[PDB]
Each structure stands twice: as C-alpha cells, then as structure tokens.
Design an enzyme around this catalytic site. Structure first.
Site, PDB file in Angstrom:
ATOM      1  N   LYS A 197       0.788  -1.249   0.000  1.00  0.00           N
ATOM      2  CA  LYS A 197       0.000   0.000   0.000  1.00  0.00           C
ATOM      3  C   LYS A 197       0.816   1.294   0.000  1.00  0.00           C
ATOM      4  O   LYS A 197       2.045   1.305   0.229  1.00  0.00           O
ATOM      5  CB  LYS A 197      -1.021  -0.005   1.131  1.00  0.00           C
ATOM      6  CG  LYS A 197      -2.068  -1.094   0.891  1.00  0.00           C
ATOM      7  CD  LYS A 197      -3.299  -0.940   1.744  1.00  0.00           C
ATOM      8  CE  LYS A 197      -4.287  -2.042   1.398  1.00  0.00           C
ATOM      9  NZ  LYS A 197      -5.463  -1.980   2.294  1.00  0.00           N
ATOM     10  N   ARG A 214      -3.440 -10.110   5.233  1.00  0.00           N
ATOM     11  CA  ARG A 214      -3.804 -10.173   3.814  1.00  0.00           C
ATOM     12  C   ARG A 214      -2.643  -9.682   2.973  1.00  0.00           C
ATOM     13  O   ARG A 214      -2.249  -8.542   3.117  1.00  0.00           O
ATOM     14  CB  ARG A 214      -5.029  -9.276   3.561  1.00  0.00           C
ATOM     15  CG  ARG A 214      -5.577  -9.326   2.135  1.00  0.00           C
ATOM     16  CD  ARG A 214      -6.890  -8.562   2.042  1.00  0.00           C
ATOM     17  NE  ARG A 214      -7.448  -8.618   0.701  1.00  0.00           N
ATOM     18  CZ  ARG A 214      -7.050  -7.870  -0.340  1.00  0.00           C
ATOM     19  NH1 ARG A 214      -6.063  -6.967  -0.230  1.00  0.00           N
ATOM     20  NH2 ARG A 214      -7.655  -8.031  -1.520  1.00  0.00           N
TER      21      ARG A 214
END
Ligand SMILES: Nc1nc(O)c2nc(CNc3ccc(C(=O)O)cc3)cnc2n1
Ligand SMILES: Nc1nc(O)c2nc(CNc3ccc(C(=O)O)cc3)cnc2n1
Lengths: 275, 263
Positions: free
Chosen positions: B202, B236
């Site tokens: 991210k 995740r």
C-alpha cells in the site's frame, strides 16, 4: 541517547542499520571491501562493522599480524573516504589500538574485552565499547549450549561486565549491550532472548543485536543461508519495535526500508516502544 | 483459543494466518495461482471479482457472479484451504456460501441493501472493515465504528463469534492516520474478536519509502510483523511465502513470551 567518538556523534533516538563487512578471506581485498562499504552506505547503513576474525561456531583463530593486515587498511580507507561510523569487530588489543588510530568509532568485541590487555587498550582509546554475551568461545560454544534461565544469566553477565568496564575507567555512557544471538545458544534460547529483549532496557544503555541470516532463522524455517532475508527482516523488526538501537545486518537496503516503517510506527506510538 | 467455523472446518487463530490475494481459461489460471499460494503457506485465499481498490470499476450482479462463483467453487472442490470472498452484494454472498466460501469479506461492512440479511442467512464468518482524509482521533473513530457495526450485526442475528475486525489500512486514510492505527492495533483486542489487516504493497509503504508498487516487499513484511507482534490474527498479502516465513519468526517469538502479545 547518543554516542561520541572521533570528534563526531551518533544519535540513537532512531534505529541504526550496521552493515557487515567481513574481511576474512575464503579460499584485491582492500578495493572490494571499500566497494562493498560504498554500496552499504548508499543503501543507508550508518555504521560499517569491519571484522577480520571469523567468530562463527568452529572458527579458527587468526594471528594478530594477519588480523591487522585485513582490518587496519580497510578501516583507514573508509574513515578517509566516507563519514559513516565504523565499528571494529575484534578482540585483540593491538587491533583495538591500531583501529582507533586510523579512525574507528566503536570497539565491537564479541569477547567483551576478555583477552589479555583488551580492557586497557579499549579504555585507552576512549571509544564506545559493545559488550556481547557469549557462553564459552567460538571454537566450542555451539557444542552443548545450556542455561537454567537464559535471560537471567545473560542479564547477570551484563551486570558483571558493565562493572568490569567501570572499574577499568570506561564510563557506563560508553557501553552498548548485545545479547549475542547464536553465541552459545540453541533455538529456544535465542527466541527467549528476542522475546524479552525490551527488558534489557533497564540498564538504560543502547542495545545492539545481530540475527542476520543466522541459524535461529535457518533452523526455524528449514531454509539455507541465502534463503533467510524475510526471516532476517522479521527478527530486525521485532528487535527494533522493542527499542533496539543498532541492527547488525548483511542486507542493508531491505533492513533500512523496514526500519523506516518501524520509525513511522514508533513516532505515532505514545510511549515510543513495544513490550 | 480463538477459532472460526465454516463449511464443516475450523480455523485455529492461536497463531497468525496468511491470506493470499487472488484477483479474478482465467478459471484455470486462478486455480493455478491458488495452488501456488497454498504451496507458499497461505491458509486463506481472498477472492475478488469487483476490484475493491478505491476508484475501481463497479460491476453488475450477473458479472460479479460470473467471475467469483466459478473460482470459489473450483477452489472449494480441489483444496482444503479457507476461502475469503470480497463482495458487497447479497446475491454474491448467498451464492458464494452455496459453493463453499468460508469468510464474507465485505469492505463496506454489509451496508448495501440486503447484504446484512444475506450474510446472516449464510451463517458464515463476516469481516467488518472501517472505511471512509480527516479525523480528530483516528483510533477512536475506527473503534466507535466497530461498536456500532458489531451491534448492527448482532441485531440482525449474527453472533459476535462470527465477526472479524479490520481497521481498513489505506481506506480514506493518509500516511499518519495509517501509522496511528498500526501503532495502536493491540488496543482493538478489547472486543475479543479476530483482527484482519491488509497493508501489503500500500501507499502507506510506497509514500514512506518513495518506491513503486513492485519494490515494497520489505516494508510490507515490516507492517505484517508489526501487526502480528500485536496479536493480529489474519494478514492479507500479495507475497505469501515471504510473509509466512516472517510469521513463523513472529510465532517463535510470541511462544517464548509470557504475554503472547506486544503492546
Ligand atoms: N556485536 C556483534 N553481535 C553479533 O551478534 C555478531 N555476530 C557475528 C557473527 N557470528 C555468528 C554467530 C552465529 C551465527 C549463527 O548462529 O548462525 C552466525 C554468525 C559477528 N560479530 C558480531 N558482533
Ligand atoms: N478486509 C480487507 N482489508 C483490506 O485492507 C483490503 N484491501 C483491499 C485492497 N484495497 C486497497 C486500498 C488501498 C490501497 C492503497 O492505499 O494503495 C491499496 C489497496 C481489498 N480488500 C480488502 N479487504
């Protein structure tokens, strides 16, 4: 928290990455050593650790003349070309003395100045000294590592060695502590120390750790020495989250990146540490 | 002691799990990629047929069913692994359950008309994620959000024992908000529910390190370790093998700790 050496300082409010520069030959060393140090500095290492005696389990000793030949030219070249701090990974008083003269910042002795004259020679330099725990010596430490309570025993050892250095005229403020991952310890001993590492902060001294590519990762994951980067970064992150100040590694870029994430996380923590 | 039950199996959350990301002959390739992630050590595979990235293209019900359902079904038949489904649509929730999915992973926390009832019907574990960048106290907002959604779920017949909580890294959150939730992640254990996090690759990493999306492995691992050391139950990720290895180191560390957590 800060260290002072060679008319500069090192600021230990954030974690530093110490890059490993092994100069023990395997069957131009100076040029390659300096090339290697250069890459590591560019990758973000703020300390380079120059080591001329292998301190691995089973390692053979090296003569003082051979260690000097390997280490001193490398320390000199780095000290005049770059501004990065320089730790010397040695137990020999003559290497300590000579290292310092050509610009070394930290004496990083895995034997914690146990050799004849090491304690006085280190005192004489006035440099910061890292005290590391090891059970036995490199030739035999991994034969049958044994503790009733490994944390308590390493903790007691640090008490004793801090005193020993104080008595020799080396001030508390010069000292770093390293629990010596892999130095006379099996798998469970290493993880007990990693898990309780923040509790060594009670000495109010910089913690230095070295787990990079070590068997505590290899044996846990069942992977070879080239396959340990992810495991090494996990150990690094775990240590740095608990307030470890210097992380000794082979893979500098990746560790430096991981330590930024840790720095970003700690600065947003209220109390600046995990326990 | 924590545990989830679905589709006649159970997930033991006494240690951290790695959930591999699977984005949807593409059926043959999805199954190939599921296989490699299982081999790498993922114990959950997250299947998405509407890319849940901010700004991604919305799809119709028919299209999402056509993408997701065959893949869930194929994986359910061939492998033992748990299957997370990224959807917000009741029809997809309903049909996913019928063909073997274990976890409803809805980034919108069952806010779409009918999603709540469809989720409750399935009896399946549900992951509640926070989403919305501006907050006074980001932790307290996310925490308040969870109290509200837990109640909303409980009201609809979904027991606490079915819920997971995700603070939603990268969703209406700038760099400093993200690192604030990561730093305080352990505080979310007062609910006594599983915590699922997804920081892999991210911008909270990209922006900090100033590298592109393929160069964020080390930072992604750093985030996973930071979360897992705080007792996060499901991570995740894109890079399954590397994360599984890092989690093994975390598990060895946590096992030697008297507390089983860092705070
Ligand atoms: N301060 C400091 N701290 C260390 O931790 C260290 N380690 C080595 C390298 N020695 C080892 C020991 C153990 C292992 C293994 O278990 O695999 C590998 C290498 C050299 N200098 C060091 N200096
Ligand atoms: N439960 C759950 N938890 C997540 O964290 C998640 N993330 C995505 C992927 N979405 C994003 C969001 C933001 C960013 C960025 O800032 O770059 C990247 C990917 C999809 N499903 C998800 N499901």
């Amino acid at each position: 928290m800060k260290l002072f050496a060679q008319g500069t300082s090192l600021d230990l409010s954030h974690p530093h990455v110490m890059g490993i520069l092994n100069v023990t030959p395997d069957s131009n060393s100076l040029i390659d050593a300096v090339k290697h140090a250069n890459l590591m500095i560019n990758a973000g290492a703020t300390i380079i650790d120059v080591g001329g005696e292998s301190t691995r389990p089973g390692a053979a000793e090296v003569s003082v003349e051979e260690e000097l030949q390997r280490v001193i030219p490398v320390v000199e070249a780095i000290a005049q070309r770059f501004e990065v701090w320089i730790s010397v990974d040695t137990s020999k008083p003559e290497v300590i003395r000579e290292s310092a003269k050509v610009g070394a910042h930290i004496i990083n002795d895995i034997r914690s100045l146990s050799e004849p004259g090491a304690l006085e020679a280190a005192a004489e330099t006035g440099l910061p000294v890292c005290l590391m725990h090891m059970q036995g010596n490199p030739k035999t430490m991994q034969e049958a590592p044994k503790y009733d309570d490994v944390f308590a025993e390493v903790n007691r050892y640090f008490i004793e060695q801090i005193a020993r250095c104080e008595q020799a005229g080396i001030a508390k403020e010069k000292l770093l502590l390293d629990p010596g991952f892999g130095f006379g310890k099996n798998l469970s001993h290493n993880y007990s120390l990693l898990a309780r590492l923040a509790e060594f902060h009670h000495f109010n001294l910089p913690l230095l750790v070295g787990m990079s590519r070590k068997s505590m990762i290899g044996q846990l994951l069942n992977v070879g020495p080239s396959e340990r980067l992810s495991g090494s970064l996990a150990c690094a992150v775990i240590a740095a989250m608990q307030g470890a100040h210097i992380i000794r590694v082979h893979d500098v870029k990746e560790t430096v990146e991981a330590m930024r994430v840790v720095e970003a996380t700690l600065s947003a923590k209220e109390n600046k540490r995990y326990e």
